[PDB]
Amino acid sequence: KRKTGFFFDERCFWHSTGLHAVTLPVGGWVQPPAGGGHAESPETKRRMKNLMDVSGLTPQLALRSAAPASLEDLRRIHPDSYLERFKAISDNGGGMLGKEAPLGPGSYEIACLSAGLACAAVEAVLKGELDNAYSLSRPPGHACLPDQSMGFCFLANIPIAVERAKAQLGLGKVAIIDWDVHHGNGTQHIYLQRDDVLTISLHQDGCFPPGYAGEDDRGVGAGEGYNINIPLLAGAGDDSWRYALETIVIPALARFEPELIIIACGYDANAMDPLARMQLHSDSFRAMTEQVQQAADRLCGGKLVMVHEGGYAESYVPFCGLAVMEALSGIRTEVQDPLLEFIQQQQPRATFAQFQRQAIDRLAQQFGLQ
Amino acid sequence: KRKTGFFFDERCFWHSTGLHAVTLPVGGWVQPPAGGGHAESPETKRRMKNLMDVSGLTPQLALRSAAPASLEDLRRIHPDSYLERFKAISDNGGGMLGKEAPLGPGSYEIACLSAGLACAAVEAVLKGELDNAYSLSRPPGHACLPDQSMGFCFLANIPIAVERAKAQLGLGKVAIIDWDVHHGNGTQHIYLQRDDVLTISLHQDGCFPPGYAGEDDRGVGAGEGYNINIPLLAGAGDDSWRYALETIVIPALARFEPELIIIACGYDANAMDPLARMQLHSDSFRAMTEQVQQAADRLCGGKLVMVHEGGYAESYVPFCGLAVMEALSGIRTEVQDPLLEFIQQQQPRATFAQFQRQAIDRLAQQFGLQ
Amino acid sequence: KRKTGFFFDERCFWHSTGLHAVTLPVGGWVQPPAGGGHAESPETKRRMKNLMDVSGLTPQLALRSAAPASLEDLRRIHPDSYLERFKAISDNGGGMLGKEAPLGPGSYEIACLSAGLACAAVEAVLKGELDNAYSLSRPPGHACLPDQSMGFCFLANIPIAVERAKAQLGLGKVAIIDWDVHHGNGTQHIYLQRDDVLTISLHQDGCFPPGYAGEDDRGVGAGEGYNINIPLLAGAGDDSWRYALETIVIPALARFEPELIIIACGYDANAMDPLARMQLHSDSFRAMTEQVQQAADRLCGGKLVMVHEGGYAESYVPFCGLAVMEALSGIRTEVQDPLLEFIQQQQPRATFAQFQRQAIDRLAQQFGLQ
Amino acid sequence: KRKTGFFFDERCFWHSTGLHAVTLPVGGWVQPPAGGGHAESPETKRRMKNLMDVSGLTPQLALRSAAPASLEDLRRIHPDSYLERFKAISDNGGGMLGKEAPLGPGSYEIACLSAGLACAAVEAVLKGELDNAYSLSRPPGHACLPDQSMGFCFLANIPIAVERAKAQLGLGKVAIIDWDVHHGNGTQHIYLQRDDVLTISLHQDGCFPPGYAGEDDRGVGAGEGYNINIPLLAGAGDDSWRYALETIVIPALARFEPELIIIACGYDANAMDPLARMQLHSDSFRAMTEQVQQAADRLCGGKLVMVHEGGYAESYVPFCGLAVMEALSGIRTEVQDPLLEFIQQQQPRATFAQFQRQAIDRLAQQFGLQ
Ligand SMILES: [K+]
Ligand SMILES: [K+]
Ligand SMILES: [K+]
Ligand SMILES: [K+]
Ligand SMILES: [K+]
Ligand SMILES: [K+]
Ligand SMILES: [K+]
Ligand SMILES: [K+]
Ligand SMILES: [Zn+2]
Ligand SMILES: [Zn+2]
Ligand SMILES: [Zn+2]
Ligand SMILES: [Zn+2]
Ligand SMILES: [Zn+2]
Ligand SMILES: [Zn+2]
Ligand SMILES: [Zn+2]
Ligand SMILES: [Zn+2]
C-alpha cells in the first residue's frame, strides 16, 4: 500500500507576525496579551507533527523538506513590485504590507520555503515517487492575491506549485478543492479566466473575506463553469460538510476529469476554532480525506496532494490533522480523539441538517450536477 | 440617572484549574501547552475590567466587593457532603471533583467570594442602594448542580444570592434570564418544581450540556410553565438573539411580573468564542442589556442584576462586557469595538435569519406567548 | 503614623515592546517564543499590585494617578528632536529608536503618564500632603539619556519629576539613590556637572551598561564629589547590599543634607532575576527601605519618594515590592515570602562576604567617608 | 572525523509538572501565572533541538531514540517502594511525591524513557558504534536520590546508565563530571562509598541543595578520595569555570584513569538563568566541552557521553547547547551567539577573577592535585 510523503521544515515554525491579541493588533483599546496571543501560531501546526511523532505514524511516512520556491517560481503568479515590497518588510524586521497584513524578520525566505514544500509535494506525486503527499506549508497561501497579502497569507502556495508543474512537467487539468473554512479567494482569483484548473471552495457563508458567499461567481470567459463556491451555513457540522462533498464536489470532479487533485486543507472548520463557527471533528476530516482519495483513485491514478492552510484551535487541530494523515497514509494509530464523542453530541439536529442538505441540493442543481 | 454597582474582587482572578490545553486536561495524547492554555482563564475577565478602567468608565460606577457567602448561604442550595468534598480538594491543592471538574488550592474560599458578590449585588439593588448592578463573579455558577460541579462552576452563584434574598429580605417573584451561550442547567434544576422563580435560557442547541436542547422541558408540579428553554441554532447571530428576546423573553417577563430581573450574563455567544458557534458582537450584548433594562423599568422599578458567567475569547469578550456595562450604566465611553463592522458583515444571510425567526415563532406559540 | 501614597495607573501596564525572547528580539537565530517572552512584561509590575490588593495593604494607602508630564516637563531634560522621534515611532505602531530600543503603539503617551506619576509623587510629598510615596512608573526611566533611549527606558522619569519640583516648588538639594541592580547611567549623566543633586548608584559590576563599573567617575566641574558609584560584585547578597548602604550611602546622605530623598527602586537584584546575578530577598529590600526611611527621618522631615525601575522575576518581584511597601507604609500584612528562607540559605559564605565588605570599605575611604 | 550520536525523543517534551509560577507552586500568596510559568519547561530543551535543525547541524549527527530503561535497570539504583509510589502518582495524573516534587500524568513512562536515552548513549559509545554522544534526557536526573525525588528529577538517569553498563558490558572505572550549576547531590550519594566511579561537581556555593558547599565531603570507606566538590562563588563566569576545569577536573581525570567520561551537562550556569547567579556564555560551554573531549582523547579512546540536566533560560540555553554539540561533533555551523559579546563584557573584573582562582588553587592543593 501507500507511500505517502510529508513535506515539512522546522523553519516554517519560525515565521512570526508580531504582537497580536488573537486576531487583533495590539494598541488603542486592545490591551497587550499576557498569553502568547496570535491565532496563526506555530503551535497549531507543531502540535500536529508532535502528535504524529508520539502516535508512531511519522516513521511510516516519507519525510521530506524542499528547496524554497525560486524567484522564477514566484513570478508565474506574483508581480515584482509585490514580491519586492514583501521582501523589503521582511528585511526590515516588520513594518506592515497594506491593510491588516503583518510579518516578521525573514518571513520572505520562510514563505518561499513554505511554497517550495507545496511545489515538491506536487512534483513527487506527479512523477510517481509518491502515491500521495501532504505539505505542512506555513505560512498558508489560499487567501493570497497576486499583488496583495491577505488572511495571514503572503504567497500563493498552491498556484505557485501548479504553475511550476504546468511549466516543467506538462501538468494538464487539475482540480483544487478547498475545505479550509474560509473562501479560497486567492486561488479563485488566479484561475478565474481559466478552464484548465477547477477551483472549488467549501466555506462558511460570509466569514472570510467577510460578507462574501460567492455561489453565483462561476468564472469568466473560458473559465466560466470552472469555479464552484459552496457557502455553508455557519453552524453546520459533519453531516452537512460530507453531504456537500458527495452531492457537489466529487460529481464535479467526475465531470471535469483532472490529472491531479489538490486539497487546500484547513482545519478551521473544527468545532473549537475561534476563527469560524463550524462543528467538524477529527472523523469529519477523516471522511473527507477518504472521499477525495477515492475520487483520486477512480480519476487520476490516486494522485492526491494536500496542502495545509488554516486551523486555529491549538488543542484540537492536531487530532484533526492526525486523522487526515491516517486516512491519507492508510495507517491507523492507537490515538482516539478525546473530544470526538462530545462534538458528535453537539451536532445540529435534523431540522437544520435537512435545511442545509436542501440548500446544497439547490446548488448542485444550479451548477448542473443534479 | 443611574447608580450602577460593579461588584468585583482581585481574589476571583486567583482561582486556578491546573493544566489544560484549552478545554482538554493534559496527558495521554494531549500535549502540554507552551501557551497558558485553559479557556476559563482569569485573563478573559480581567481584560474586561482593565478596559473599563482605561475607557474612563470605572470611576463613574459604584465599585464594591463583598463578604463571601456564609456556610448557611451555601446550604440553602448545596448539601454538606458536596460542600465538604469541594472544600477538601481545595484544601489539598487539587485532586478532581468527579467527571471533568478540576480546581486549585483555595478555590473553595474564592468560590464562596464569587457567590458573595452575587449575593451583595442582589441585596444592594433590592434595598434601593443601587438602581442596578453587575457582579464579576468568577468562578461562574450557572451549570453547578446542588451536588455536582459542572462546566467550570462549583457553587450556584445566582440561586445562592436569590435564596438569601428570599430568606432575609422577603424577595417574591424573580426572573432569571440566561444568555450565556450554554444551557443554564444548574438554575433550571434548582427551580424546576417552583413557580416563584422564572428561569429562561437562550442557548446553543446541543452545546453544553452536550446534546441537550430542552424546548419541551417546561417544569414539574407547581413549576410547570415556569421554565423556558430557547435552543438557538448554532451559527445564529445578532438578528436571531434579539428576535428571541423580543418575541419570547420580554413577553414572558410581562406575563410573570417579577420583583427582580437577574441576568446570567455570559459572553460566550460572541463571534470569536472557542466554546460555541454563535456570531454576536458588542452591539448585540448592548441591545440585549437595553431590552432587559427596559422590561425592568416597566415591571420592577428598574431593578436589574447581572452576574457574569462564561466567555472565552480573551481579545473580544472585553469589548462585549464594556458594551454591557455602558448600557447598564447609561454611560457611553469613547471606545469603538474594532471588530464590530467585521462581525456585522459575517452575519447569516436572510435565508437562515428567516428560518431561525420561524423557529422562534413556533416556540413562542408553543409557550403560549404568540 | 504614615500617610503613604501609591501612584499607579492601569495604562502603564498597556505599554508594549513587541516580540522578544526574554531580552532578545525575534529573528535570525532567535526562534519566536511560544510563551509570552519579553522580560519587561506588564506582569512583573501588575503582580505586585495584585498581591498588595489580596494582602489587604492597598486600602490602607493613598492611591492616586496623575496627569501625564507636560511637553514642557519633558523639555527640561530632553531635546525636541528626541521627543519628536519617539513620538513618531509611537504614532506608527513600532519601528525602533536606534540600537536596541523598541516600543509599541501609544508608548509615547504612556511614557508621559509614567513620568507624571513620578512628578506627582514628588510634589505630594514635598507639599506635605503625604509623608512618603511610591510610584509604579512603567516604563522605567533610570537608563534614559536626554537624547537616547536605553535599557527599556524612554523618558527620564526621576529627573523630569525633580526639575519640575525645582521649577515650580523651589526644591533645593535632593539625593537620588539607585538600588536597581543596573547602573543609573541616565540619572548620572543628567546631573554630572551639578552639586544640587547627589546621585548614588549601587549596581552589579559590568552588568548594564555592560562593562561599566564607574567607581572613579565622581562628577565634573561643580558636580565633582556629587556622583557616587558602588560596583558590587556579581553574586553578592543581603549582607553586602546592606553593608554598602550603611557604610557608604547613608553617610553620604548625612554629609550632603538633602531636602528630599528619592529611591530609584528596581528589584532586579532579587535572587531569581534573569537580568542580573545578585542574591537579594524580600527582607533585603525591606531593610534597605528602612535604612533610607530612617535617614529621611533624621535629615529631611521623613520626605522619601520611591520610583519603580527594573525587576524581571515574575513570581518573586511581587514579594519584594510588597515588603518595600510594607516598610514604607509602616504596615505589616500576613504575607510570608515563601522563598525567604530558601534564598537566605543560598547567601555567599563568609569568605566572599568579607571580601565584599573590604571592597566597600576601600570605596568609602576613596569617597572620603571612612 | 566524528560520529556523534544525539539521543532524543518527542515524548520527553510531553512530561509536565502542573501549575507553577517559575519555581513556585500556585496558591496561597502565589498568583497563577498568565504566562506559561514553570522553569523546567519543555521549551528550554526543544529550542535547543530546533536551533540545531535550522543551523544545519542535526542532519550531520547520528539521531537516535531508545527503548525506555527496564524495571530491572531502575532497580539497580532505586528501591521498589519509591518506584511504585512515583508510578502511582503518574497513574493518577498528579498528587505530589513528598516535599517540593510534582509530576504529571504519564511522567513515569517518560522518565523511564529519559533514562533509557542515557543508557543507550552510554552503550553505543562503549561498543564503538559512536565516537561520542549526547542525550537530551528530560526529565533530568542528577539530583534524584534512590528513594527521593528532588530538583525536578525523578530517576537517576546517569547512575542507571552506568550500572547497566557495569552489568551488561563489563564497564570498569568511569568519571562523571557535573557542570550543571547545582550540586550533583544524587550522583554523589549513589557513589559515595565506591572507588570505581569518580564523581566531580562544579556548582554554585549554596545554591541547590540550598546551603550546601561540599568541599570537605570526599567520600566514605573505599570511596574516600573518589568524590570531588568545587563550590564556585556565585557571580563567577568564564575565567573561573575554565580555570576550575583545568586546575582541578582534568588533573583529577589524569590521576584516576577512567574507561569513560560522562558529563552531567546542565546549562543553568549561563548568564541569564533565573535558577543561579553564574555568568557563562556559549563559548564557555564550548571550551569546557573541548577540555573534556581532549582529556577523553588522552585517557579513554575519545569515549565521552554527555547527558542533559538543567538550564532555564529559554532564549539563551539553545545557543549554549548548540555550542556544546558543535564542540562535541567537531562541526561549526554559521550561528553566532547574539549575546556572546554582551556577556563577555559583563564578566567579573580581575580582583574577583583572582580571588576565585586563589580559592580553586587551595582546593586543588586540598585534593592533592597541586
Ligand atoms: K474553503
Ligand atoms: K478556474
Ligand atoms: K443560556
Ligand atoms: K422555575
Ligand atoms: K543602580
Ligand atoms: K550630581
Ligand atoms: K554541578
Ligand atoms: K565515588
Ligand atoms: Zn482559514
Ligand atoms: Zn457526527
Ligand atoms: Zn457558557
Ligand atoms: Zn449585525
Ligand atoms: Zn535594572
Ligand atoms: Zn540573609
Ligand atoms: Zn541545575
Ligand atoms: Zn569571556
Residue numbers in the entry:
A (entry chain A), B (entry chain A), C (entry chain A), D (entry chain A): 2 to 371
What does the paper say about this structure?
A double-His motif, (KpHdaH (1b): His143/His144) plays an important role during catalysis. The first His (KpHdaH: His143) of this tandem His motif acts as an electrostatic catalyst during catalysis, i.e. it orients and polarizes the catalytic water molecule, and it is itself oriented and polarized by an Asp (KpHdaH (1b): Asp179). The second His (KpHdaH: His144) acts as a general base abstracting a proton from the catalytic water molecule, thereby activating the water molecule for nucleophilic attack on the carbonyl carbon of the acetyl/amide-group, i.e. the acetyl-lysine, the acetylated polyamine or the small molecule amide. A mutation of the second His in KpHdaH (KpHdaH H144A) leads to an inactivation of the enzyme while not affecting the overall conformation. We also analyzed catalytically inactive enzymes obtained by mutation of an active site catalytic His residue, as control.
